[PDB]
Amino acid sequence: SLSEYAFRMSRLSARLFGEVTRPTNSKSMKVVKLFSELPLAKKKETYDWYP
């Protein structure tokens, strides 16, 4: 829903800030979220829950 100037300017901004450049749907964006954060088990709360 953007013009050519807006689309390429937005795509340029993503390259500058290191965001996703190629067009990606909502489902495949979860891969970015999976590696952007530690898994639930890897969190210090989980494996060190008990003394």
């Binding site: 050519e4 689309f7 390429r8 795509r11 340029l12 993503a14 390259r15 500058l16 450049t21 067009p23």
Partner: peptide, 26 residues
Amino acid sequence: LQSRKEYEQELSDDLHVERYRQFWTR
């Protein structure tokens, strides 16, 4: 309805590695 355009398929240039690599220092 599938919208495909010439500029939408153009890969963004990796300006960090080539154009602005000299800016990583100082």
